[PDB]
Amino acid sequence: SKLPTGVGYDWTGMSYQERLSGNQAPSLYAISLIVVFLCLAALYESWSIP
Amino acid sequence: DTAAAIRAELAKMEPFFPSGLKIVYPYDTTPFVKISIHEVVKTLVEAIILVFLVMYLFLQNFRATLIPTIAVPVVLLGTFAVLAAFGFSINTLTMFGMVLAIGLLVDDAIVVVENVERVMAEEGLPPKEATRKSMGQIQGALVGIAMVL
Amino acid sequence: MPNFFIDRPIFAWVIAIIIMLAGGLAILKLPVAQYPTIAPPAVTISASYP
Amino acid sequence: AKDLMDKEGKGLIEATLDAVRMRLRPILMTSLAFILGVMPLVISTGAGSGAQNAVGTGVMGGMVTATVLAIFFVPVFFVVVRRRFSRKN
Amino acid sequence: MLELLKSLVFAVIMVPVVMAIILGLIYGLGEVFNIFSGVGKKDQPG
Amino acid sequence: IAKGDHGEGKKGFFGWFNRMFEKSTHHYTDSVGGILRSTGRYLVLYLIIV
Ligand SMILES: CCCCCCCCCCCCO[C@@H]1O[C@H](CO)[C@@H](O[C@H]2O[C@H](CO)[C@@H](O)[C@H](O)[C@H]2O)[C@H](O)[C@H]1O
Numbered sequence: 221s222k223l224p225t226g227v228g229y230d231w232t233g234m235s236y237q238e239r240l241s242g243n244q245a246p247s248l249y250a251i252s253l254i255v256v257f258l259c260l261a262a263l264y265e266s267w268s269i270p
Numbered sequence: 271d272t273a274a275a276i277r278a279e280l281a282k283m284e285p286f287f288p289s290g291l292k293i294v295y296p297y298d299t300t301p302f303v304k305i306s307i308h309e310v311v312k313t314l315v316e317a318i319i320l321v322f323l324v325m326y327l328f329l330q331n332f333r334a335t336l337i338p339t340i341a342v343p344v345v346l347l348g349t350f351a352v353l354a355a356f357g358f359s360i361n362t363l364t365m366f367g368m369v370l371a372i373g374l375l376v377d378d379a380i381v382v383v384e385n386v387e388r389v390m391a392e393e394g395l396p397p398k399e400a401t402r403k404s405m406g407q408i409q410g411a412l413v414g415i416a417m418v419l
Numbered sequence: 420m421p422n423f424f425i426d427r428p429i430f431a432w433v434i435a436i437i438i439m440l441a442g443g444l445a446i447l448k449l450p451v452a453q454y455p456t457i458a459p460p461a462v463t464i465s466a467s468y469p
Numbered sequence: 470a471k472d473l474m475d476k477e478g479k480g481l482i483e484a485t486l487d488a489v490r491m492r493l494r495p496i497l498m499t500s501l502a503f504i505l506g507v508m509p510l511v512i513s514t515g516a517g518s519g520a521q522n523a524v525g526t527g528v529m530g531g532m533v534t535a536t537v538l539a540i541f542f543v544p545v546f547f548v549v550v551r552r553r554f555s556r557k558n
Numbered sequence: 559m560l561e562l563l564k565s566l567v568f569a570v571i572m573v574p575v576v577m578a579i580i581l582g583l584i585y586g587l588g589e590v591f592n593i594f595s596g597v598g599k600k601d602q603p604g
Numbered sequence: 605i606a607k608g609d610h611g612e613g614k615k616g617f618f619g620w621f622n623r624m625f626e627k628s629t630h631h632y633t634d635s636v637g638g639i640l641r642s643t644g645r646y647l648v649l650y651l652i653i654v
């Protein structure tokens with residue numbers, strides 16, 4: 221940002237990719253954790269037993 | 271999505287514009303569609319309200335009215351799932367179609383919730399015994415109404 | 420068919436919720452656009468002799 | 470009415486009357502729920518209201534006449550399809 | 559959110575109004591269907 | 605709930621409603637009695653609206 225005007229930037233390749241997402245693990249392990257909290261009870265038929 | 275890409279493609283440009291030069295959007299289809307879906311979503315919510323009012327006004331109990339209310343969202347979003355799996359989009363037409371869908375579907379729920387109510391109101395048997403009995407006299411109707419429809 | 424669920428109250432909740440996540444995901448993943456394409460696709464050749 | 474016919478011991482007329490009397494309310498619950506479900510679309514204006522009006526005023530008129538009027542006529546159809554052409558044996 | 563208050567007021571007011579009308583319609587129709595109660599069918603199918 | 609009660613003995617507006625509804629019901633039923641004695645004209649009035 222501290223360079224002459226008219227100069228800008230962009231990321232490519234690996235850099236470009238890491239932009240889309242690098243870490244979704246905490247989201248999809250979270251949904252893993254809820255679909256697990258409930259799918260077990262789909263047999264234990266129990267509150268909190270899972 | 272294309273327009274969404276176009277504001278992106280273009281959002282990177284302004285910092286290197288010369289002095290005095292500014293963008294402007296004289297013809298734009300999108301906010302029509304943002305609004306078209308805003309309006310239907312709001313009709314849907316207020317419909318869910320109105321259903322819950324006719325439910326209270328008829329079963330006269332806070333508890334009873336939770337049942338058919340909960341069952342509607344499950345149906346309607348459930349539809350996104352299945353029409354996603356047939357390659358259909360959440361468009362003007364489709365999204366608009368499901369309001370009618372909400373309308374039809376609500377009673378699929380209530381006919382049975384009610385029928386159980388009315389059955390327990392004379393032989394006076396618990397919710398289990400009554401709802402089971404209720405399934406016995408109707409459940410067969412529900413598949414066929416659905417088939418013929 | 421229904422009775423099975425009458426005895427098994429939660430498992431229904433599991434069916435419903437799985438459908439709740441399926442649909443709630445199905446918005447976030449599906450394309451949003453006014454019009455499902457409705458015209459004969461057409462290609463257009465274009466020339467210019469000055 | 471049919472269930473009262475076979476699964477219980479009944480002829481048509483009295484069966485119909487009991488079905489229709491037991492069944493009357495639900496019809497209104499549904500139709501009131503429904504007609505009111507669609508309320509916004511018919512009342513709606515602006516914001517590209519062309520569609521939801523055309524859909525709602527279509528389903529509404531057809532919802533009243535299919536309720537206020539059909540609860541009277543259904544019984545006659547179900548009787549006439551039997552009373553005038555049934556298995557006497 | 560504010561449109562929701564509008565929704566609630568229309569809702570509460572309207573639920574009875576429409577309700578009455580549809581009952582009014584069967585109540586009325588019932589009376590006119592009472593007046594005009596017909597003789598029966600014809601013997602041709604038999 | 606009780607066996608046989610249709611909520612008439614209930615506090616407030618709600619009872620009024622249940623009574624006038626149950627009334628609307630008797631009316632309607634006693635009216636379908638009349639209609640059902642008169643199968644024919646109805647079949648052909650049905651024709652006029654068809
Ligand atoms: C899995 C994909 C396929 C889905 C479609 C499968 C069809 C069967 C659905 C399972 C539900 C049971 O389906 C069952 O069918 C028979 C067929 O008359 C009905 O048996 C019948 O009972 C009495 C008279 O016999 C009447 O109410 C009615 O004539 C009919 O329902 C049951 O009431 C219905 O519950």
Ligand code: NI
Pocket residue numbers: 630634
């Ligand atoms: Ni009487």
